[PDB]
Amino acid sequence: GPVPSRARVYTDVNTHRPREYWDYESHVVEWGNQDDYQLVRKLGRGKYSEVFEAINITNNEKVVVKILKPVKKKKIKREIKILENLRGGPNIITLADIVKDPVSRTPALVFEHVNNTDFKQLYQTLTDYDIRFYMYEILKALDYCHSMGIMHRDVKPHNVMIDHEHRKLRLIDWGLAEFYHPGQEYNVRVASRYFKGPELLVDYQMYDYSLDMWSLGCMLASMIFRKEPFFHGHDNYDQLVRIAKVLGTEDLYDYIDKYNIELDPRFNDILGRHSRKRWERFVHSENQHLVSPEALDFLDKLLRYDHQSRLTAREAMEHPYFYTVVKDQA
Ligand SMILES: COc1ccccc1-c1ccc(CNCCC(=O)NCCCCNc2nc3cc(C(=O)O)ccc3c3cnccc23)cc1
Numbered sequence: 001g002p003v004p005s006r007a008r009v010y011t012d013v014n015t016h017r018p019r020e021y022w023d024y025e026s027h028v029v030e031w032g033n034q035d036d037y038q039l040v041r042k043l044g045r046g047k048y049s050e051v052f053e054a055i056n057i058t059n060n061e062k063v064v065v066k067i068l069k070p071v072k073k074k075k076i077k078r079e080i081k082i083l084e085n086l087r088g089g090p091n092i093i094t095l096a097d098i099v100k101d102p103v104s105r106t107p108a109l110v111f112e113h114v115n116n117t118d119f120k121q122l123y124q125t126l127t128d129y130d131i132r133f134y135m136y137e138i139l140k141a142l143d144y145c146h147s148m149g150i151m152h153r154d155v156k157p158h159n160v161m162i163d164h165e166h167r168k169l170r171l172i173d174w175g176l177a178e179f180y181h182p183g184q185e186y187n188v189r190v191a192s193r194y195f196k197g198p199e200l201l202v203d204y205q206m207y208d209y210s211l212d213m214w215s216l217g218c219m220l221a222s223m224i225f226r227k228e229p230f231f232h233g234h235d236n237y238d239q240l241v242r243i244a245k246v247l248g249t250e251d252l253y254d255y256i257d258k259y260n261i262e263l264d265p266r267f268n269d270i271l272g273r274h275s276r277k278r279w280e281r282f283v284h285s286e287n288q289h290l291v292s293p294e295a296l297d298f299l300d301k302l303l304r305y306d307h308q309s310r311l312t313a314r315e316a317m318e319h320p321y322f323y324t325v326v327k328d329q330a
Pocket of ligand 1: 043044051064066093111112113114115116119122130131132134135138157158159160161162172173174219223
């Protein structure tokens with residue numbers, strides 16, 4: 001069978017905690033009354049949720065209500081418990097309250113409101129400094145939750161909210177997050193297709209926090225190359241082919257061998273033979289102002305097949321790419 005694997009940081013964080021920290025299944029919820037909030041307008045529909053702007057009628061304060069589409073009661077306790085555990089973490093979204101509509105009884109979570117800068121105001125005047133600044137901010141959130149024994153598992157642009165006027169960022173939607181336990185085999189059918197690490201794409205189930213660092217590298221490539229998304233696959237199978245044409249086929253089969261991943265017979269005759277590209281081939285006149293030897297080095301060390309060789313979040317924060325933003329913050 002498949003060679004096992006261990007996270008190389010924060011491996012046992014959870015084992016050294018009280019059961020109640022990670023045994024969410026047995027967490028008692030106290031559901032308030034959603035009438036305390038008055039819906040203003042719909043802001044998004046998701047696969048698992050529906051989000052609304054609302055007003056807290058006690059203090060006229062602006063809030064966001066997430067009405068949970070029907071899942072197993074476990075996955076609601078999971079998300080809630082993870083939000084309580086992460087409360088007050090740097091750049092984590094804050095869970096304000098937990099409520100049920102009194103006539104409908106469908107459960108809902110209440111969050112803090114973040115003012116969102118238009119994407120056509122962000123993309124146009126993105127400096128090289130702006131990409132480093134917020135990348136550093138996402139890594140604060142990611143290194144924190146990893147240090148608390150949690151994986152986000154759905155890191156993508158949709159779930160990173162940025163208030164550029166206040167230069168503050170927030171990692172949202174924790175509905176896919178899990179606790180890390182050494183040896184646990186996890187569900188691979190998570191995250192969005194473009195941001196799925198190769199471990200999901202091959203059904204290697206013993207993954208860890210480093211899954212969240214593949215997604216972040218996917219975002220970094222998407223931004224500095226002005227290509228959205230960077231790995232643009234038609235389906236979950238072509239996604240690996242899209243990846244393999246950049247990272248090369250050689251490191252892939254060594255990855256397959258090292259963990260003895262039995263690979264789907266669909267993959268045999270579709271990947272092929274592909275050299276590992278040099279990143280320079282992705283730069284051009286209309287994107288080079290964001291590209292540098294430093295950013296390239298940092299990018300290379302996030303996108304690895306072998307999840308063990310990816311930088312940890314705290315390794316990323318110590319990379320030279322961030323040296324200017326580390327010193328300006330002091
Ligand atoms: C400067 O570039 C970067 C540089 C470096 C690294 C990254 C970036 C970068 C790239 C792209 C983007 C995309 N741009 C955000 C996507 C977006 O805007 N997605 C709203 C979809 C529903 C909106 N509605 C709300 N949904 C919520 C759900 C939850 C939850 O489920 O927990 C919690 C809170 C809210 C919430 C809070 N306040 C207002 C609205 C909402 C952001 C940053």
